[PDB]
Amino acid sequence: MTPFWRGVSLRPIGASCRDDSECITRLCRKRRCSLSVAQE
């Protein structure tokens, strides 16, 4: 677990989201992916 912004089996940081599970980090920040930064 390191390349959060790469072609993983999930959605990378710099990608769009649908559900937290869609994002590699399991964090759906306003329909977008990101790290442990759910503040905006």
Side-chain angles (χ1 to χ4, degrees):
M1 187 185 72
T2 0
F4 302 110
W5 33 86
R6 283 309 180 250
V8 288
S9 329
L10 289 178
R11 267 85 285 174
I13 312 291
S16 310
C17 180
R18 300 164 174 122
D19 174 277
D20 305 271
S21 322
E22 278 276 298
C23 296
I24 182 183
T25 21
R26 202 106 201 256
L27 199 144
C28 206
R29 179 176 151 158
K30 287 198 205 148
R31 210 231 297 160
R32 292 166 267 126
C33 293
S34 46
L35 294 162
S36 335
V37 280
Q39 284 185 329
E40 69 146 78

Short mmCIF file of all heavy atoms in Angstrom, two decimals:
data_model
loop_
_atom_site.label_atom_id
_atom_site.label_comp_id
_atom_site.label_asym_id
_atom_site.label_seq_id
_atom_site.Cartn_x
_atom_site.Cartn_y
_atom_site.Cartn_z
N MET A 1 0.85 -1.21 0.00
CA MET A 1 0.00 0.00 0.00
C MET A 1 0.88 1.24 0.00
O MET A 1 1.42 1.62 1.03
CB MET A 1 -0.91 0.00 1.23
CG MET A 1 -1.93 1.12 1.24
SD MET A 1 -2.89 1.19 2.76
CE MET A 1 -1.66 1.80 3.91
N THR A 2 1.02 1.87 -1.16
CA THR A 2 1.85 3.06 -1.29
C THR A 2 1.42 3.94 -2.47
O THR A 2 1.15 5.12 -2.29
CB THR A 2 3.35 2.69 -1.44
OG1 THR A 2 3.52 1.26 -1.41
CG2 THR A 2 4.18 3.33 -0.34
N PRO A 3 1.34 3.39 -3.71
CA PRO A 3 0.94 4.16 -4.89
C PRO A 3 -0.56 4.45 -4.92
O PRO A 3 -1.30 3.83 -5.68
CB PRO A 3 1.35 3.27 -6.07
CG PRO A 3 2.13 2.14 -5.48
CD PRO A 3 1.65 2.00 -4.07
N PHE A 4 -0.99 5.40 -4.10
CA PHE A 4 -2.40 5.78 -4.04
C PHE A 4 -2.82 6.55 -5.29
O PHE A 4 -4.00 6.68 -5.60
CB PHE A 4 -2.67 6.65 -2.80
CG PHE A 4 -2.31 5.99 -1.50
CD1 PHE A 4 -1.23 6.44 -0.76
CD2 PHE A 4 -3.06 4.94 -1.01
CE1 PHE A 4 -0.90 5.85 0.44
CE2 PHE A 4 -2.74 4.34 0.19
CZ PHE A 4 -1.66 4.79 0.92
N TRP A 5 -1.83 7.07 -6.00
CA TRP A 5 -2.07 7.84 -7.22
C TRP A 5 -1.57 7.10 -8.45
O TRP A 5 -0.93 7.68 -9.32
CB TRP A 5 -1.40 9.21 -7.10
CG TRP A 5 -0.12 9.19 -6.32
CD1 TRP A 5 1.13 8.92 -6.80
CD2 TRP A 5 0.04 9.45 -4.92
NE1 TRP A 5 2.05 8.99 -5.79
CE2 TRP A 5 1.40 9.32 -4.62
CE3 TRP A 5 -0.85 9.79 -3.89
CZ2 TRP A 5 1.91 9.50 -3.34
CZ3 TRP A 5 -0.35 9.97 -2.62
CH2 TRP A 5 1.02 9.83 -2.35
N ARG A 6 -1.85 5.80 -8.52
CA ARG A 6 -1.43 4.99 -9.65
C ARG A 6 -2.57 4.12 -10.14
O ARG A 6 -3.67 4.17 -9.59
CB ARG A 6 -0.22 4.12 -9.27
CG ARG A 6 1.09 4.89 -9.22
CD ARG A 6 1.32 5.69 -10.49
NE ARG A 6 2.58 6.44 -10.46
CZ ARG A 6 2.65 7.77 -10.37
NH1 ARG A 6 1.55 8.50 -10.23
NH2 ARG A 6 3.84 8.37 -10.40
N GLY A 7 -2.30 3.31 -11.16
CA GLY A 7 -3.30 2.44 -11.74
C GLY A 7 -3.59 1.23 -10.88
O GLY A 7 -3.25 0.10 -11.25
N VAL A 8 -4.18 1.46 -9.73
CA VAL A 8 -4.54 0.39 -8.81
C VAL A 8 -5.87 -0.24 -9.22
O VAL A 8 -6.47 0.14 -10.22
CB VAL A 8 -4.64 0.91 -7.36
CG1 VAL A 8 -3.25 1.22 -6.82
CG2 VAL A 8 -5.54 2.13 -7.28
N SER A 9 -6.33 -1.20 -8.43
CA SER A 9 -7.58 -1.89 -8.72
C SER A 9 -8.79 -1.07 -8.29
O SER A 9 -9.94 -1.52 -8.40
CB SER A 9 -7.59 -3.25 -8.02
OG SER A 9 -6.27 -3.76 -7.91
N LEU A 10 -8.53 0.13 -7.85
CA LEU A 10 -9.55 1.04 -7.41
C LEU A 10 -9.31 2.40 -8.04
O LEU A 10 -8.55 2.52 -9.00
CB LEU A 10 -9.54 1.15 -5.88
CG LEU A 10 -10.04 -0.08 -5.13
CD1 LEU A 10 -9.94 0.13 -3.63
CD2 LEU A 10 -11.47 -0.41 -5.53
N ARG A 11 -9.97 3.41 -7.53
CA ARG A 11 -9.82 4.76 -8.04
C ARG A 11 -8.71 5.48 -7.29
O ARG A 11 -8.73 5.56 -6.06
CB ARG A 11 -11.13 5.53 -7.92
CG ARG A 11 -12.00 5.47 -9.17
CD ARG A 11 -12.89 4.23 -9.19
NE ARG A 11 -12.14 3.01 -9.53
CZ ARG A 11 -12.66 1.79 -9.51
NH1 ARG A 11 -13.94 1.61 -9.23
NH2 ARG A 11 -11.89 0.73 -9.77
N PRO A 12 -7.71 5.99 -8.02
CA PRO A 12 -6.58 6.71 -7.43
C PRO A 12 -7.02 8.06 -6.86
O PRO A 12 -8.16 8.48 -7.05
CB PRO A 12 -5.61 6.93 -8.59
CG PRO A 12 -6.11 6.06 -9.70
CD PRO A 12 -7.58 5.89 -9.48
N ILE A 13 -6.12 8.74 -6.17
CA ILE A 13 -6.40 10.04 -5.57
C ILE A 13 -6.94 11.02 -6.59
O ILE A 13 -8.04 11.55 -6.45
CB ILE A 13 -5.14 10.65 -4.94
CG1 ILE A 13 -4.42 9.62 -4.07
CG2 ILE A 13 -5.49 11.90 -4.13
CD1 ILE A 13 -5.18 9.24 -2.81
N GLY A 14 -6.15 11.26 -7.62
CA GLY A 14 -6.54 12.18 -8.67
C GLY A 14 -7.60 11.60 -9.60
O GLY A 14 -7.48 11.69 -10.82
N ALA A 15 -8.63 10.99 -9.02
CA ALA A 15 -9.71 10.41 -9.80
C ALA A 15 -11.07 10.75 -9.22
O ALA A 15 -11.18 11.31 -8.13
CB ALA A 15 -9.56 8.90 -9.90
N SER A 16 -12.11 10.40 -9.97
CA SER A 16 -13.47 10.65 -9.55
C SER A 16 -13.97 9.51 -8.67
O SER A 16 -13.46 8.39 -8.75
CB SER A 16 -14.37 10.83 -10.77
OG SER A 16 -13.81 11.76 -11.67
N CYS A 17 -14.97 9.79 -7.86
CA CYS A 17 -15.51 8.80 -6.94
C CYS A 17 -17.01 8.61 -7.13
O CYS A 17 -17.69 9.42 -7.75
CB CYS A 17 -15.21 9.24 -5.51
SG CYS A 17 -15.82 8.12 -4.22
N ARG A 18 -17.50 7.50 -6.59
CA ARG A 18 -18.91 7.15 -6.62
C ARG A 18 -19.36 6.72 -5.22
O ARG A 18 -20.50 6.92 -4.82
CB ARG A 18 -19.16 6.00 -7.60
CG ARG A 18 -18.77 6.31 -9.04
CD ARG A 18 -18.67 5.05 -9.87
NE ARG A 18 -18.43 5.33 -11.29
CZ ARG A 18 -17.38 4.88 -11.97
NH1 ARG A 18 -16.44 4.16 -11.36
NH2 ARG A 18 -17.26 5.16 -13.27
N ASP A 19 -18.41 6.13 -4.50
CA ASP A 19 -18.59 5.64 -3.14
C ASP A 19 -17.20 5.54 -2.54
O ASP A 19 -16.25 5.39 -3.29
CB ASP A 19 -19.28 4.26 -3.15
CG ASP A 19 -19.36 3.63 -1.77
OD1 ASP A 19 -18.37 3.01 -1.33
OD2 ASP A 19 -20.43 3.74 -1.13
N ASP A 20 -17.06 5.64 -1.22
CA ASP A 20 -15.73 5.58 -0.61
C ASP A 20 -14.96 4.35 -1.08
O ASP A 20 -13.77 4.42 -1.37
CB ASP A 20 -15.80 5.57 0.91
CG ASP A 20 -16.58 6.75 1.47
OD1 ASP A 20 -15.96 7.80 1.71
OD2 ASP A 20 -17.80 6.61 1.63
N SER A 21 -15.68 3.23 -1.21
CA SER A 21 -15.09 1.96 -1.64
C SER A 21 -14.49 2.07 -3.04
O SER A 21 -13.59 1.30 -3.39
CB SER A 21 -16.15 0.86 -1.60
OG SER A 21 -17.00 1.03 -0.48
N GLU A 22 -14.98 3.01 -3.83
CA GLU A 22 -14.47 3.23 -5.17
C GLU A 22 -13.06 3.78 -5.12
O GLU A 22 -12.23 3.47 -5.97
CB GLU A 22 -15.38 4.20 -5.94
CG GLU A 22 -16.62 3.55 -6.54
CD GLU A 22 -16.34 2.91 -7.88
OE1 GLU A 22 -15.96 3.64 -8.82
OE2 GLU A 22 -16.49 1.68 -8.00
N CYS A 23 -12.78 4.58 -4.10
CA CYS A 23 -11.47 5.18 -3.94
C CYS A 23 -10.53 4.23 -3.22
O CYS A 23 -10.94 3.52 -2.30
CB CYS A 23 -11.56 6.50 -3.18
SG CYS A 23 -12.51 7.80 -4.04
N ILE A 24 -9.28 4.23 -3.64
CA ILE A 24 -8.24 3.38 -3.06
C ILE A 24 -8.12 3.57 -1.55
O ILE A 24 -7.91 2.62 -0.80
CB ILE A 24 -6.88 3.65 -3.74
CG1 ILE A 24 -5.80 2.72 -3.19
CG2 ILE A 24 -6.48 5.11 -3.59
CD1 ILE A 24 -4.44 2.99 -3.78
N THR A 25 -8.25 4.81 -1.11
CA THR A 25 -8.14 5.15 0.30
C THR A 25 -9.48 5.07 1.05
O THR A 25 -9.54 5.40 2.23
CB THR A 25 -7.57 6.57 0.45
OG1 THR A 25 -7.78 7.30 -0.77
CG2 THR A 25 -6.09 6.52 0.78
N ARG A 26 -10.53 4.62 0.35
CA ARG A 26 -11.87 4.49 0.95
C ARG A 26 -12.33 5.83 1.53
O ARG A 26 -12.83 5.89 2.65
CB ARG A 26 -11.88 3.41 2.03
CG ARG A 26 -13.27 2.85 2.32
CD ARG A 26 -13.44 1.46 1.74
NE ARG A 26 -14.85 1.12 1.57
CZ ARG A 26 -15.54 0.30 2.36
NH1 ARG A 26 -14.94 -0.26 3.42
NH2 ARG A 26 -16.81 0.03 2.10
N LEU A 27 -12.16 6.89 0.76
CA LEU A 27 -12.56 8.22 1.19
C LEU A 27 -13.14 8.99 0.00
O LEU A 27 -12.40 9.48 -0.85
CB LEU A 27 -11.37 8.97 1.79
CG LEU A 27 -11.75 10.16 2.68
CD1 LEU A 27 -10.77 10.28 3.84
CD2 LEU A 27 -11.77 11.45 1.87
N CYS A 28 -14.45 9.06 -0.04
CA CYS A 28 -15.15 9.75 -1.12
C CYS A 28 -15.37 11.22 -0.77
O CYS A 28 -16.43 11.60 -0.26
CB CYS A 28 -16.47 9.04 -1.42
SG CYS A 28 -17.07 9.28 -3.12
N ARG A 29 -14.37 12.03 -1.06
CA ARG A 29 -14.42 13.46 -0.77
C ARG A 29 -15.23 14.21 -1.83
O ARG A 29 -14.71 14.56 -2.89
CB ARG A 29 -13.00 14.01 -0.69
CG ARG A 29 -12.91 15.51 -0.43
CD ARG A 29 -11.47 15.95 -0.25
NE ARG A 29 -11.27 17.34 -0.66
CZ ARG A 29 -10.26 18.12 -0.25
NH1 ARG A 29 -9.38 17.67 0.64
NH2 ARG A 29 -10.17 19.36 -0.71
N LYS A 30 -16.52 14.39 -1.55
CA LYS A 30 -17.43 15.11 -2.44
C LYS A 30 -17.41 14.54 -3.85
O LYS A 30 -17.24 15.27 -4.83
CB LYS A 30 -17.10 16.61 -2.47
CG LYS A 30 -17.50 17.36 -1.21
CD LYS A 30 -17.57 18.85 -1.46
CE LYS A 30 -17.36 19.65 -0.18
NZ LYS A 30 -16.69 20.95 -0.46
N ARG A 31 -17.55 13.22 -3.93
CA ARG A 31 -17.58 12.49 -5.20
C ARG A 31 -16.21 12.47 -5.88
O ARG A 31 -16.10 12.20 -7.07
CB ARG A 31 -18.64 13.08 -6.15
CG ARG A 31 -19.25 12.07 -7.10
CD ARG A 31 -19.20 12.55 -8.54
NE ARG A 31 -19.99 13.76 -8.74
CZ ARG A 31 -19.82 14.61 -9.76
NH1 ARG A 31 -18.89 14.37 -10.67
NH2 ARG A 31 -20.59 15.69 -9.86
N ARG A 32 -15.16 12.76 -5.11
CA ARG A 32 -13.80 12.73 -5.63
C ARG A 32 -12.93 11.93 -4.68
O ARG A 32 -13.26 11.77 -3.51
CB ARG A 32 -13.23 14.13 -5.79
CG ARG A 32 -13.90 14.96 -6.87
CD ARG A 32 -13.54 16.43 -6.75
NE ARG A 32 -14.52 17.17 -5.95
CZ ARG A 32 -14.20 17.91 -4.89
NH1 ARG A 32 -12.95 17.98 -4.46
NH2 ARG A 32 -15.15 18.58 -4.24
N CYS A 33 -11.82 11.42 -5.18
CA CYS A 33 -10.92 10.65 -4.35
C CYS A 33 -9.87 11.55 -3.71
O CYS A 33 -9.60 12.65 -4.20
CB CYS A 33 -10.25 9.53 -5.14
SG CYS A 33 -11.40 8.22 -5.69
N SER A 34 -9.28 11.06 -2.62
CA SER A 34 -8.26 11.80 -1.89
C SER A 34 -7.76 10.95 -0.72
O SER A 34 -8.29 9.87 -0.46
CB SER A 34 -8.83 13.12 -1.36
OG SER A 34 -10.09 12.93 -0.76
N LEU A 35 -6.72 11.44 -0.05
CA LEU A 35 -6.17 10.75 1.11
C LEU A 35 -7.04 11.05 2.32
O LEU A 35 -8.21 11.39 2.17
CB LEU A 35 -4.72 11.21 1.35
CG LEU A 35 -3.73 10.82 0.26
CD1 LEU A 35 -2.47 11.66 0.36
CD2 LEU A 35 -3.38 9.34 0.36
N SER A 36 -6.48 10.92 3.51
CA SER A 36 -7.20 11.21 4.74
C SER A 36 -7.39 12.73 4.90
O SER A 36 -7.06 13.30 5.94
CB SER A 36 -6.43 10.63 5.93
OG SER A 36 -5.61 9.55 5.51
N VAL A 37 -7.93 13.35 3.87
CA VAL A 37 -8.16 14.79 3.85
C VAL A 37 -9.60 15.10 3.47
O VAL A 37 -9.87 15.77 2.48
CB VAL A 37 -7.21 15.49 2.84
CG1 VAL A 37 -5.83 15.67 3.45
CG2 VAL A 37 -7.12 14.70 1.53
N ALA A 38 -10.54 14.61 4.27
CA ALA A 38 -11.96 14.83 4.02
C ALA A 38 -12.42 16.17 4.59
O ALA A 38 -13.33 16.22 5.42
CB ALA A 38 -12.78 13.69 4.60
N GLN A 39 -11.79 17.25 4.15
CA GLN A 39 -12.13 18.59 4.62
C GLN A 39 -12.09 19.60 3.48
O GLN A 39 -11.02 19.91 2.96
CB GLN A 39 -11.18 19.03 5.74
CG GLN A 39 -11.46 18.36 7.07
CD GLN A 39 -10.59 18.90 8.19
OE1 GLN A 39 -9.45 19.31 7.96
NE2 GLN A 39 -11.11 18.90 9.41
N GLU A 40 -13.27 20.08 3.09
CA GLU A 40 -13.42 21.07 2.04
C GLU A 40 -14.89 21.41 1.89
O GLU A 40 -15.72 20.66 2.43
CB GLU A 40 -12.86 20.57 0.70
CG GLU A 40 -13.67 19.44 0.07
CD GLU A 40 -13.68 19.51 -1.44
OE1 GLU A 40 -12.68 19.11 -2.07
OE2 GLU A 40 -14.70 19.95 -2.01
#
